[PDB]
């Protein structure tokens, strides 16, 4: 697809202004919960490497791990949703503007289609 050269694109914008017309991901998004789970696993591994009681060594450190992962994951999800929206928008616009490349197929019914039959013997 290569939307790097897409016209009207700001060189270093993480989320453009037009991205604000899309619904934001919910705070209970399953992907956000998975990001928080990744942060929790990072905290547990940090406890294990430093040779501390894994489950209950640093609660502030684990909370910061989870919170940072959730924050970055929320913004990443917003950007990903925006990029897929752009892809679909361009696809539909291109199909609309080139009708001779996407003709409407003349609908046919299985009663008037001759399909070959292969017996299983």
């Amino acid at each position: 697809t290569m939307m790097s050269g897409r016209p009207g694109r700001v060189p270093l914008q993480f989320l453009p202004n037009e991205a604000r017309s899309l619904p934001p991901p919910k705070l209970t998004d399953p992907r956000l919960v998975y990001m928080g789970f990744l942060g929790y696993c990072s905290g547990l591994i940090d406890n294990a490497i430093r040779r501390r009681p894994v489950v209950s060594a640093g609660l502030h450190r684990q909370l910061l791990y989870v919170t940072s992962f959730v924050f970055f994951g929320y913004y990443l999800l917003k950007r990903q949703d925006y990029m897929y929206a752009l892809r679909d928008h361009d696809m539909f616009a291109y199909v609309k503007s080139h009708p001779e490349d996407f003709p409407e197929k003349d609908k046919k019914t299985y009663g008037e289609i001759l399909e070959e039959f292969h017996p299983v013997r």
């Binding site: 292969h118 299983v120 013997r121």
Partner: protein, 459 residues
């Protein structure tokens, strides 16, 4: 489907936060509860399927496999309790974690509605098994065994992935429902021939097909008892389930692409069976018998008839239960004798009579004595093969005779005759071992009362 998946995931924190002396009790109890919950999947329809969501669906082909998978976990825990006595708490928890992760991967693999999702979980099942084999295996060959079990598998499954993505660029979907409803014939072409081979070989290598089966004896004789149980009972059936699912897009090429494999199976089942006649290791004998039964399942799937599919499903379930029981019996001998050689411990019927009864029932079930579901599957496959070609009976008939021979051979060498004089450490059977055998054998004889549960979606 999440009503089964979420408790299986919750098994992990329950295992890790358990007391040091209460891991086995809690794991066994909650695995049994999960099996009871999964029993509800057996209520199937004659219509399409139990399409829970966009990601998971259940069928009367998937439901018995799921029930077997959930039932095998408590038995594996009971079998592993003994030889893991002198192990540290953390490593025991890691062992239980590997078993739980394997169960989770299998559960999801059977119910996945997408071919790519199925491939990912079908490969994810490899890592726990490899760790179990190469970490808690006993002999030094385990490392080599693990390597075989890995690379064979991967050598078959890397082409499949390619084919899969290729298919999704042509049809536009890998969802099984859409794939079934929008199926189109495969024209006889070299490209189509290689696509067929790519779609078939990954499932052939895990059955295993004769000539591609060299990994299985190594892996099964080198694995710990729980690893052997899960490998023989469930992991072999992944190839059968995959071939049953994927053959819908391979017609009418299968009409003539199946010839090399059919021969390789029909002759192969003879060879492996004859191999069982001259074997000095119990586990090796049981593994080769598994190869013979799976060759019959391969023939059933390649024939592609309703009776063939019914027989293949029934035989898969029956073989899973029977081979798991046989491996457990062999291990209960090994933990007393520490040899794994058939002719060392002899005349055990005199010293352990109830275990001899368990041996007899397991041998009878492996021998396909009617009306066991083993014989139901075997007879349906044989009838379908006879319709395919009347000459097949010859080979099929021969296999039957040979099977009985080696089965009774294994029963006579270990249980009958005179006891070995210098072996004086054969203690009475524990309640745990007897309960393990009973929990293996009662479901088989119960299932013979309602065979429709294990006859698949073409019943």
């Amino acid at each position: 489907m999440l009503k089964i998946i979420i408790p299986t995931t919750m098994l992990l924190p329950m295992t890790w936060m358990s007391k040091h002396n209460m891991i086995w009790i809690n794991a066994t109890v909650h695995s049994l509860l999960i099996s009871l919950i999964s029993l509800s999947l057996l209520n199937q329809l004659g219509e399409n399927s139990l399409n829970f969501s966009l990601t998971f669906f259940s069928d009367s082909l998937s439901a018995p496999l799921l029930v077997l998978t959930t039932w095998l976990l408590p038995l594996m825990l009971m079998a592993s309790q003994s030889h893991l006595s002198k192990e540290t708490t953390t490593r025991k928890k890691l062992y239980i974690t590997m078993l739980i992760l394997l169960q989770l991967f299998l559960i999801m693999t059977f119910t996945a509605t997408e071919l790519i999702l199925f491939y990912i979980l079908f490969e994810a099942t490899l890592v726990p098994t490899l760790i179990i084999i190469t970490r808690w295996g006993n002999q030094t060959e385990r490392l080599n065994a693990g390597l075989y079990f890995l690379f064979y598998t991967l050598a078959g499954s890397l082409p499949l992935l390619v084919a899969l993505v290729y298919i999704q660029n042509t049809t536009g979907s890998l969802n099984f429902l859409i794939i079934h409803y929008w199926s189109h014939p495969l024209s006889n072409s070299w490209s189509n021939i290689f696509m067929w081979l790519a779609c078939i070989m990954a499932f052939m290598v895990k059955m295993p097909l004769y000539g591609l089966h060299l990994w299985l004896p190594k892996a099964h004789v080198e694995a710990p008892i729980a690893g052997s149980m899960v490998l023989a009972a469930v992991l072999l059936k992944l190839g059968g389930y995959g071939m049953m699912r994927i053959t819908t897009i391979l017609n009418p090429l299968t009409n003539y692409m199946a010839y090399p494999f059919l021969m390789l199976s029909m002759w192969g089942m003879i060879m492996t069976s004859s191999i069982c006649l001259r074997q000095t290791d119990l586990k090796s004998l049981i593994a080769y018998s598994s190869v013979s039964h799976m060759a019959l399942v391969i023939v059933a799937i390649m024939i592609q008839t309703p009776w063939s599919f019914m027989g293949a499903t029934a035989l898969m379930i029956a073989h899973g239960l029977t081979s798991s029981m046989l491996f457990c019996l062999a291990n209960t001998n090994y933990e007393r004798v520490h040899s794994r050689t058939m002719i060392l411990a002899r005349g055990l019927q005199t010293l352990l009579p109830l275990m001899a009864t368990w041996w007899l029932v397991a041998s009878l079930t492996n021998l396909a004595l009617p009306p066991s579901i083993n014989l139901i599957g075997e007879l349906f496959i044989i009838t379908a093969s006879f319709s395919w070609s009347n000459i097949t009976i010859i080979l099929m008939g021969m296999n039957m005779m040979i099977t009985a021979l080696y089965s009774l051979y294994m029963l006579i060498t270990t249980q009958r005759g005179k006891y070995t004089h210098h072996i004086n450490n054969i203690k009475p059977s524990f309640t745990r071992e007897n309960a393990l055998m009973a929990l293996h054998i009662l479901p088989l004889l119960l299932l013979t009362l309602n065979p429709k549960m294990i006859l698949g979606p073409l019943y």
